Structure formats: C-alpha cells, structure tokens
Design an enzyme around this catalytic site. Structure first.
Site, short mmCIF file in Angstrom:
data_model
loop_
_atom_site.label_atom_id
_atom_site.label_comp_id
_atom_site.label_asym_id
_atom_site.label_seq_id
_atom_site.Cartn_x
_atom_site.Cartn_y
_atom_site.Cartn_z
CD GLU A 1 -9.35 -2.86 1.80
OE1 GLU A 1 -9.13 -2.05 0.88
OE2 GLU A 1 -9.30 -4.10 1.64
CD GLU B 1 -6.31 3.08 -4.90
OE1 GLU B 1 -5.41 3.54 -5.64
OE2 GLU B 1 -6.29 3.21 -3.66
CE1 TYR C 1 -4.06 -1.89 0.12
CE2 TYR C 1 -3.14 -2.98 2.04
CZ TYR C 1 -4.10 -2.90 1.06
OH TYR C 1 -5.11 -3.84 1.03
CD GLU D 1 -5.10 -5.14 -9.17
OE1 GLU D 1 -5.91 -4.40 -8.57
OE2 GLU D 1 -3.89 -4.87 -9.32
CG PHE E 1 -0.73 0.36 -4.14
CD1 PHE E 1 0.25 -0.24 -4.92
CD2 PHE E 1 -1.84 -0.40 -3.77
CE1 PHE E 1 0.13 -1.55 -5.33
CE2 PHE E 1 -1.98 -1.71 -4.18
CZ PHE E 1 -0.99 -2.29 -4.96
CG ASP F 1 -16.12 -9.12 -1.16
OD1 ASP F 1 -16.67 -8.45 -2.06
OD2 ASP F 1 -15.24 -9.98 -1.40
CG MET F 2 -16.97 -4.61 -3.80
SD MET F 2 -16.22 -3.40 -4.89
CE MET F 2 -14.63 -3.18 -4.09
CE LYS G 1 -4.14 4.73 -8.35
NZ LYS G 1 -3.81 3.55 -7.51
CE1 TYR G 2 -4.65 6.68 -4.81
CE2 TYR G 2 -2.29 7.06 -4.74
CZ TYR G 2 -3.37 6.20 -4.67
OH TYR G 2 -3.16 4.85 -4.46
C1 LIG Z 1 -3.55 0.43 -6.69
C2 LIG Z 1 -2.84 -0.59 -7.57
C3 LIG Z 1 -1.49 -0.44 -7.87
C4 LIG Z 1 -0.87 -1.43 -8.69
C5 LIG Z 1 0.51 -1.34 -9.04
C6 LIG Z 1 1.09 -2.32 -9.86
C7 LIG Z 1 2.57 -2.29 -10.24
O1 LIG Z 1 2.93 -1.93 -11.32
N1 LIG Z 1 3.55 -2.74 -9.25
C8 LIG Z 1 4.96 -2.76 -9.56
C9 LIG Z 1 5.70 -1.46 -9.28
C10 LIG Z 1 5.27 -0.28 -9.86
C11 LIG Z 1 5.97 0.88 -9.58
C12 LIG Z 1 7.08 0.83 -8.75
C13 LIG Z 1 7.87 2.10 -8.44
F1 LIG Z 1 9.13 1.77 -8.03
F2 LIG Z 1 7.96 2.85 -9.58
F3 LIG Z 1 7.26 2.82 -7.46
C14 LIG Z 1 7.45 -0.39 -8.21
N2 LIG Z 1 6.76 -1.49 -8.49
C15 LIG Z 1 3.12 -3.21 -7.94
C16 LIG Z 1 3.70 -2.35 -6.82
C17 LIG Z 1 3.56 -4.66 -7.76
N3 LIG Z 1 4.31 -4.99 -6.72
C18 LIG Z 1 4.71 -6.24 -6.53
C19 LIG Z 1 4.33 -7.20 -7.45
C20 LIG Z 1 3.55 -6.83 -8.53
N4 LIG Z 1 3.18 -5.56 -8.65
C21 LIG Z 1 0.32 -3.38 -10.33
C22 LIG Z 1 -1.02 -3.47 -9.99
C23 LIG Z 1 -1.62 -2.47 -9.16
N5 LIG Z 1 -2.94 -2.58 -8.86
C24 LIG Z 1 -3.53 -1.69 -8.09
N6 LIG Z 1 -4.94 -1.86 -7.78
C1 LIG Z 2 -5.70 0.02 -3.14
S1 LIG Z 2 -5.67 -1.64 -3.96
C2 LIG Z 2 -7.41 -2.26 -4.14
C3 LIG Z 2 -8.04 -2.45 -2.74
O1 LIG Z 2 -9.35 -2.97 -2.87
C4 LIG Z 2 -9.54 -4.02 -1.94
N1 LIG Z 2 -10.44 -4.81 -2.47
C5 LIG Z 2 -10.29 -5.53 -3.58
N2 LIG Z 2 -11.44 -6.21 -3.84
C6 LIG Z 2 -12.35 -5.89 -2.84
C7 LIG Z 2 -13.70 -6.27 -2.56
N3 LIG Z 2 -14.41 -7.21 -3.45
N4 LIG Z 2 -14.32 -5.75 -1.45
C8 LIG Z 2 -13.69 -4.91 -0.66
N5 LIG Z 2 -12.41 -4.52 -0.89
C9 LIG Z 2 -11.72 -5.01 -1.98
C10 LIG Z 2 -8.17 -4.66 -1.79
O2 LIG Z 2 -8.03 -5.25 -0.59
C11 LIG Z 2 -7.24 -3.46 -1.93
O3 LIG Z 2 -6.93 -2.84 -0.60
#
Ligand SMILES: Cc1cc2cc(C(=O)N(Cc3ccc(C(F)(F)F)cn3)[C@H](C)c3ncccn3)ccc2nc1N
Ligand SMILES: CSC[C@H]1O[C@@H](n2cnc3c(N)ncnc32)[C@H](O)[C@@H]1O
Lengths: 308, 625
Positions: free
Chosen positions: B380, B423, B312, B432, B315, B407-408, B321-322
C-alpha cells in the site's frame, strides 16, 4: 331588492332583452379579491346597471362568461367553474333561483346557446369540448371533441333543432347536425384565414350566417352558396347580433371598444364609441326596434338610437 | 409518499380555495395569477387605460404560502406566436406582466403551454425574462404526450382522422419541447410538465421523454377508469406509466373537474398514494445509492492521490464484492495446492494496493475456508492507510501478514508471489491505471503465478439525457477552458437518462501480460444501432472483470453483479448534442493514450455526424501515473 347583492361586479359580460322588454344582465369581477359573477333582471332597462332599481338579483359561485334566456323565465349560464348553470325566475319574478349547477367541463365554459327545441342547449369550453344538454333531465346527452383548441363560440340554428355552429382557435368553423353519424362538417373558406371569434345565424335565411375574426373582419357566408366580407373593426370581433327587423341589420361589437351597425351588404350605417372598454354584448329591444342596448367592461349600459 | 398538486382555472377567492385544496390532501395549487378571461390592452386607447387593480393583492397570502404552495399559470389568451401583430404585441407585454408578477410574488414555479408547433416568440419572451435579474424559480412547460389535433374525435365527416401510422408525426410534441428548450439554450429553469392523455400513444412516443427534465405529470380526471365500487382507477397501461414516472419522483398534478361525483374528490389522490406504496420496495442498491441520482463526481485517482479514510469506508460497505474476491481466492488455492500437499505448501499471496485491509481479510478467510496455508504481503503506497494496516498487523494479523509501505511498481520483493490480488479498478475498469500498476508488479509474480483479477473489459453505450448534458454544462469553472467540463468523464449514478443502444465492449486487459512488447494504449471503433429518434448527449461506461475462472464482477446492466453497489457507472460527455434518427448508427471512437507521466482518454463521434475530438493530448483530463 332582497337576496340581491349591494353592487354588481364591474365587468359586464352579457345583455339579453326578453320578449316583454325586460333586460337580463350578466357580470363578473375579473379583478380584485373576489372573482365571481352575478345575474340581474331589469324590467326597467333605463335604470341599469344601478342595483337599487333592479327587478331581481343573485350572485353566482364564479364568473359569467356567457348566458342566454331559456324561454322567458330561465337563465342558462356558462361559468368559470366549468359548470353550465340554469337559473329560473320565481313566479313573483323577484328572485332568481338555482335550478341546476352541473360541473361537466374541465375548464372555463366560454359559450352557450339554446337550441330551437327550447329543451336542449349546446355549450363550448376551453377544454376543447362541446356538449349537448337536456335541460329537463339536467344531463349531458353528447360530448363532442371535434376541435383541437378552446371553443370560442357555439350558436344554435334558429329553426333546426339539431343544427348549430361552432368555431375554435384551431381555425375551424364547424357546422353541426346531430342527425348525421358524424355530426360535424368543416365549412368556410378552404384557405385558412384569421381565427374566427363570433357567429350569428341569419334570422330568416336558414343557410346564411355571419362570422367575425380576430383581425376585425366581418364575413357573410352562404353555406349552400358558391363570400362577402368587410374590415369593420380594428381588433377582435367579439359578437354579432342581428336586428329583429324584417330585413335585419347586423350589430358588430369588438375589443376596439366600438359598436357598428351594418346592413345586408356589410356596409356601415352606424358607429358608436360610447364605451371606454371592451364591448361585450348588444341586444335589440323588441318594443322599440331602433334601440340597441350594449354593455361592456366599463360598467356602462348604453341605449343606442339606431337610424333605421 | 407522493407529492401532489391541484390544477384549477377558477379561483373565486384564494383563501377558501387553498383551504379546500389542502383539506383534500394536495401539497400545492396551480392557479392563475390574473383572471384567465381578463384580457388586457397595452397600446390602443381607451382600453389601455382600464382603471382598477389589474389582479388581486399579494397580501392575500403569506410570503411562505406564495413561496411554497402556489404555482402560477400563464393566461390562456396570451399567444405570443399569433399571426395578428396586435395580438402578438399584447401577448408579449401580458406575458412579461404575468411572469414579472410571478417573480414579484416569489412563486416556485410557473406553468406555460406548448400547445402548437411554433413557439419561437414565446421562447424569446421567456428567455428575455430568465435573463432579467438572477432568479431560480422553475418554468414548467405544459406539453401533452399526444397533440390535441391527434386525439380529437373522428366526428368531422369531411375531415376524417388519420388512420395511417406516422412514426415521426406521432412524436411531434417531443419536437415542440425540444425546439423550445433549444431556443432557450437548455436553461436549467425550464422543465417539462408532461400531460397524460386518455389514450396513451405507442411506446416509442412515450420513450422520447426518457432522459428529459420531467418535473411534473398532469393527470386529467377524464383519464381515470371506474372500478366496481366506483372509485377512480387507471388502466394497466397507465399504471405502468405512473410507476415509471414514480422512479423519476416527479410531482403529480390533478386537473379537470370531478367525474366520480358519487365519491369524494380526494379519491383521485388516494389512488396515486395507493399505487406508490405498492411499487417494488427499495432494493439493496437503491437503499444505499439514495441521493446520488445523476450527481456528478470527479473519478477518484487512488494512484495519484491518497484516498481519505471515509472513502475506504465506503469501499468496504459492500459484502458482495469481497465475498466474490474471497470465493475467487478460495478456488485458486484449491487449484494450486493439492489435498496431499496442504500442510507443506505455503502459498505466497500479495495484496497489491491493500487500502485498509479488506482484501487481506478476505484472503485470510479464503485460506481457512480452503484449509490451506498462505503467506501474505499487503502492499500500500498510501501511508495514511498503512497506519490502519500496521495497527491491524500488530493487533490481529500477526507475522502472517507483512505490511509493505511502497509503490508496487518500485517495491523490491524478497520473494515471488503465487497470487497477486488487487482492486485497482474504476468505473471504466482501467481508468485508475490498474494495467500500469500490475505491469510493474508483474516481475515478482511466479512464472506460473495467478493475478486476481485475471482480466477486465470496459463497456460503452450511447445515452440520451438532456438533464445530464445540462449538469455537465453547469460545471464550467473559472480560470480554465470554458468547455473543459465536456472533455472529462464523471462517476455518476445514471438515473434520468435513455440508453440508446446496447453496451458494447471497449478496452480489455489481462494479467499477467505475457506479451513481449507491452502496449496499454488502445484505439476502438464502436457502431451503435439506434432504432429510435433521439438526441445523443454522451456515453455511459461500465466494466466487467474476471476475478478467477467463473467468478466475476460486473456493473454492465445486463450482467450486473446482483446486490453489489461499489461502483457507479461513468459518463463521457460530448460538447454538442447530436441528433440521431431511427435506423441510424452512432459511431464513436475511443483512444486510450499515455506518456511516461499521464494516461488519458480521447473520444469522438464520427456518425451520423462528426463531433470534435474530445480531450486531445489530455488537455482537459489526465490520470496521473
Ligand atoms: C475499490 C474502488 C471503489 C471505487 C468506487 C467508485 C464509485 O462508484 N464511487 C461512488 C459511489 C459508489 C457507491 C456509493 C454507495 F452509496 F452506493 F455506497 C457511493 N458512491 C466512489 C465511492 C467515489 N467516491 C467519490 C468520488 C468518486 N467516486 C469508483 C471507483 C472505485 N475504484 C476503486 N478502486
Ligand atoms: C482499495 S483502492 C486501491 C488501493 O491501491 C492503492 N494503490 C493504487 N496504486 C498503487 C501502487 N502503484 N502501489 C501501491 N498501492 C497502490 C491505492 O492507494 C488504494 O488504497
């Protein structure tokens, strides 16, 4: 002798008789801690390769891949360092002094040859290039990249200042004439054969030369001709040296550690397995025309009596 | 800083040479380990019994010096693919001898030439050596951009050089390398030492080498130009190539003698360092993603798995992004509540998958920025992140935010939402299971409610990358299908690769889904025109999403959100590389499949040749519902 190393390196690379009968020697260490070379003069050829009995000696920066007399006191050297080197005997003929050392080739300089004008020379190198040298100004006049692989041999025409041969591992034998806008002409067998490894112009006939190949074949070629060959050696033909006779013989030497002497039809007259390693050069005495001096990597200087 | 080596074919005496090379500034030295002219015999007497040492002693350098400063070089007389059997035999034995001495010394790398078309026996001897014991040292294949026959002077009067363009023929040296590595079965220890020439070939010839494992670039001194002061420099074209090799961070090798003898020899090195410090400095994306180039990772599954705290945190390091999310919520609030109704209308916002609250905070900031009243639910299912959320709610948010640990898809909401924000998007948008999640949360969205994001679309593009194909391959595991690693996608910062065609949209989803019958399964056929010769190793995946109206997020290269580094691309591999010729079309087909427990992708190439269908029934990869 002063300014001469206590011992020459084991791998003897070259042996050239001067007009007066003195023997020039080139050698390199191809193993051990130090990989360098040396140049020697033996006014007494029967004392070679013993260092104590030499007339003059000097050691070079790197190994000696090839050399040739320049006149009667100059020594032109193809060096491992990528340099063509010119050394000159002093008036005493007791020292060998560096005239120039020019680093123009990007790889080992494998072969060198003095043109008939006496003031120019050609060098071939593992960098595929061939260069025309002006010995007086100590500069490259032309740099030719005609081949597509390392250049194995260059040999200047006996009496044409602008003509020389070359042969490379790209399977080309090139006839050069710097009077032509495109100075190289690919000659030899239209069908590709085994790679050519050595060249020797016929000393009398301006159109005739011989070449040996990597497979042991010695071939007699008339360029104006419209081929004679013999399987003389069991491995690569390293060099070909014509005798100084009116009707000359052909000394062929190989990595099969043997020396052979052929007549005009490439028929065999003599054969010597005196060497126990690669035979690297062979030179005919101008004083006694039946003496043939060979050197090799076994550090032997052998004086052959050739039945002529 | 540039990592540089000096290539020499003449070393009288190692200690002196290494010292002079180190003084000049070089990091390593490529040299022969046997004398380049010291041809050796192994069969025929008496030359076979040549006495004395065969080369100089290992005692001349420390182990550490051999391990880190010396790159070996195969002797130039060794020709395993000669036509003369005796030369073949001797070259096989001498090659083994020199390679074994390299391994004896612990050399980190060894240079071997690819200077002709047929190197089958060279490949077999190297492969036999690689499979003799277990070692990790590298073999650098010395291959030129332009073949020696193709750049010789046009000075042979009866053999003129070709002046007619040969598109495939001018690519011949890539084929030398490709065939060689194919015989050696893509050994990870075999890489390319690309030799640059005086005249660069056309852009397509260079472009073959994209995605190839180039570990070194050899720059002869003869290719350097000579500037006003006489210092060695390079042409505008060569500078462009150096810059684009610097991005692969290769090692640079200087070969040849000094041709600027007025200047010192180090100046060749000094110009490379000059170029390296004047490239565009690291952008924000490159600063953060350092170390992740071509590093394979399993995609996160935030639905099936509970994400860790530091995930997190990663993220959350992305302000772009935000703020985009904030701007999207800001614009929706103004659209939904008029200026006159701003004090009476309280909008009910639900963050579906709140994580640690970054979306909740951005919604609060958007409410103030829009100066409108909002009620927040933070849903969450990860109870570890709910700890973070409930500590936030108690300390800071107060009763404006209601944290829901559910769970939503199961939560019985007490009221309906004006806006749902989420997200739930992966590198390939829907990977996802964002569609399945928002589908089940849809019932407590008002009939005129907005979903942020409202839409998202995945993109695929065929890529060439022998390196990446080689790293998937290395992901074989115990106790599972030995080809399973090819039947799953990886999240990876694609670096050393070649994109073969422009990205094309794949799967698209919109929310809310007004369709009476909702089906998230998908089947897509894509035709990619490939105007180059190449080898297909997989497909890069990207996505675009519409948060609200014109507010978007994208990792698709040609519309990439500037500065946002939250998502790396995804990679779908294929089991077997596929040859593609110029003018041919790559056809790939992707399915999104599902049952009540799992969602997965299947894929197959159908042109120019068919591949196997990958991941059938999710046998190697599924996404848990
Ligand atoms: C909210 C959200 C974020 C997500 C981010 C990814 C992703 O791209 N990464 C790899 C990663 C990106 C950037 C950096 C750096 F350095 F630039 F910050 C380091 N790592 C993540 C962190 C990752 N970590 C471990 C294993 C696989 N993926 C993929 C799916 C995601 N889904 C989401 N819902
Ligand atoms: C910020 S990454 C997406 C977030 O959504 C949550 N999440 C994913 N799917 C669900 C769901 N079906 N209900 C509630 N939270 C979820 C995951 O736990 C994660 O913290």
């Amino acid at each position: 002798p002063p300014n001469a190393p206590a011992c020459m390196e084991r791998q003897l690379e070259a042996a050239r008789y001067r007009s007066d009968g003195a023997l020039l020697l080139g050698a390199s260490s191809l193993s051990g801690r130090c990989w360098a070379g040396s140049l020697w003069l033996f006014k007494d050829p029967c004392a070679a390769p013993n260092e104590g009995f030499c007339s003059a000696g000097v050691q070079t920066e790197a190994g000696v891949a090839d050399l040739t007399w320049v006149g009667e006191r100059g020594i032109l050297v193809a060096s491992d360092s990528g340099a063509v080197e010119l050394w000159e005997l002093d008036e005493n003929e007791t020292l060998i002094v560096s005239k120039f050392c020019k680093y123009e080739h990007d790889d080992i300089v494998s072969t060198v040859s003095v043109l008939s004008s006496g003031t120019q020379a050609v060098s071939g190198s593992k960098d595929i290039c061939i260069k025309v040298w002006d010995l007086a100004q100590q500069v490259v006049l032309s740099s030719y990249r005609a081949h597509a692989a390392q250049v194995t041999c260059v040999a200047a025409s006996p009496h044409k200042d602008s003509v020389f041969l070359s042969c490379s591992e790209d399977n080309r034998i090139l006839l050069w004439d710097t009077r032509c806008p495109k100075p190289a002409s690919q000659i030899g067998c239209s069908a590709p054969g085994y790679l050519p490894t050595s060249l020797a112009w016929h000393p009398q006939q301006s159109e005739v030369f011989v070449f040996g190949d990597e497979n042991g074949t010695v071939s007699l070629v008339d360029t104006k001709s419209t081929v004679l060959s013999s399987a003389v050696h069991s491995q690569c033909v390293t060099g070909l040296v014509f005798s100084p006779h009116s009707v000359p013989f052909l000394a062929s030497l190989s990595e099969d550690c043997s020396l052979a002497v052929l007549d005009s039809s490439l028929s065999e007259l003599f054969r010597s397995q005196a060497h126990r390693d690669f035979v690297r050069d062979a030179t005919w005495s101008p004083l006694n025309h039946s003496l043939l001096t060979t050197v090799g990597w076994d550090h032997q200087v052998v004086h052959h009596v050739v039945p002529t | 800083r540039v990592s540089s080596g000096r290539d020499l074919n003449c070393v009288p005496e190692i200690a002196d040479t290494l010292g002079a090379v180190a003084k000049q500034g070089f990091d390593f030295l490529c040299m022969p380990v046997f004398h380049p002219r010291f041809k050796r015999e192994f069969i025929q007497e008496p030359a076979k019994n040549r006495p004395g040492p065969q080369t100089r002693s290992d005692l001349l350098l420390s182990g550490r010096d051999w391990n880190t400063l010396i790159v070996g070089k195969l002797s130039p007389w060794i020709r395993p693919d000669s036509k003369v059997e005796k030369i073949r035999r001797n070259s096989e034995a001498a090659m083994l001898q020199e390679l074994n001495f390299g391994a004896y010394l612990g050399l980190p790398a060894f240079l071997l030439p690819l200077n002709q078309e047929d190197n089958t026996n060279l490949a077999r001897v190297l492969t036999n050596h690689i499979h003799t014991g277990h070692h990790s040292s590298m073999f650098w294949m010395r291959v030129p951009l332009v073949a020696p026959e193709d750049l010789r002077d046009d000075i042979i009067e009866n053999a003129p050089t070709t002046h007619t363009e040969e598109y495939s023929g001018e690519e011949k040296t890539w084929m030398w390398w490709h065939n060689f590595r194919t015989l050696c079965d893509y050994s990870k220890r075999i890489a390319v030492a690309l030799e640059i020439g005086a005249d660069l070939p056309s852009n397509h010839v260079i472009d073959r080498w994209l995605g190839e494992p180039i570990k070194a670039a050899i720059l002869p001194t003869s290719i350097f130009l000579t500037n006003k002061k006489g210092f060695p420099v390079l042409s505008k074209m060569h500078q462009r190539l150096i810059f684009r090799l610097l991005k692969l961070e290769v090692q640079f090798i200087i070969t040849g003698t000094n041709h600027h003898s007025e200047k010192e020899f180090c100046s060749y090195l000094q110009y490379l360092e000059y170029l390296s410090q004047n490239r565009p400095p690291p952008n924000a994306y490159e600063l953060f993603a350092k170390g992740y180039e071509d590093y394979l990772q399993s995609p996160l599954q935030p639905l099936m798995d509970n994400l860790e705290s530091q995930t997190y945190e990663v993220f959350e390091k992305d302000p772009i992004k935000y703020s985009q999310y904030q701007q999207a919520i800001y614009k929706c609030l103004l659209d939904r509540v008029p200026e006159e109704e701003k004090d009476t209308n309280v909008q009910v916002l639900m963050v579906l998958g709140a994580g640690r609250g970054p979306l909740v905070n951005a919604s609060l900031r958007a409410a103030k920025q829009a100066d409108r009243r909002i009620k927040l639910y933070a849903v969450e299912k990860n109870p570890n992140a709910v700890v973070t959320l409930e500590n936030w709610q108690f300390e800071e948010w107060g009763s404006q935010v209601t944290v829901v640990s559910s769970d939503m898809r199961e939560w019985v909401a007490p009221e309906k939402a004006d806006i749902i924000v989420s997200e739930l998007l992966g590198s390939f948008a829907d990977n996802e299971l964002s569609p399945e999640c928002l589908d089940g949360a849809q019932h407590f969205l008002k009939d005129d409610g907005v979903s942020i994001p409202g839409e998202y679309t995945s993109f695929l593009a065929p890529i060439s990358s022998s390196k990446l194909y080689n790293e998937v391959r290395a992901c074989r595991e115990k106790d599972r299908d030995p080809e399973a690693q090819f039947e799953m996608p990886y999240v990876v910062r694609l670096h050393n690769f070649h994109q073969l065609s422009a990205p094309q949209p794949c799967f698209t989803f919109s929310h809310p889904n007004r369709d009476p019958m909702i089906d998230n399964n998908r089947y897509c056929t894509l035709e990619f025109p490939v105007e180059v010769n190449t080898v297909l190793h997989g497909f890069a995946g990207y996505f675009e999403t519409v948060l609200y109206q014109d507010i978007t997020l994208s990792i698709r290269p040609e519309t990439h959100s500037p500065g946002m580094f939250s998502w790396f691309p995804i990679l779908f591999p294929i089991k077997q590389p596929i040859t593609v010729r110029e003018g041919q079309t790559i056809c790939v087909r992707f399915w999104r499949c599902s049952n009540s427990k799992k969602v997965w992708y299947e894929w197959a190439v159908t042109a120019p040749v068919c591949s196997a269908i990958h991941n059938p029934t999710g046998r190697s990869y599924t996404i848990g519902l």
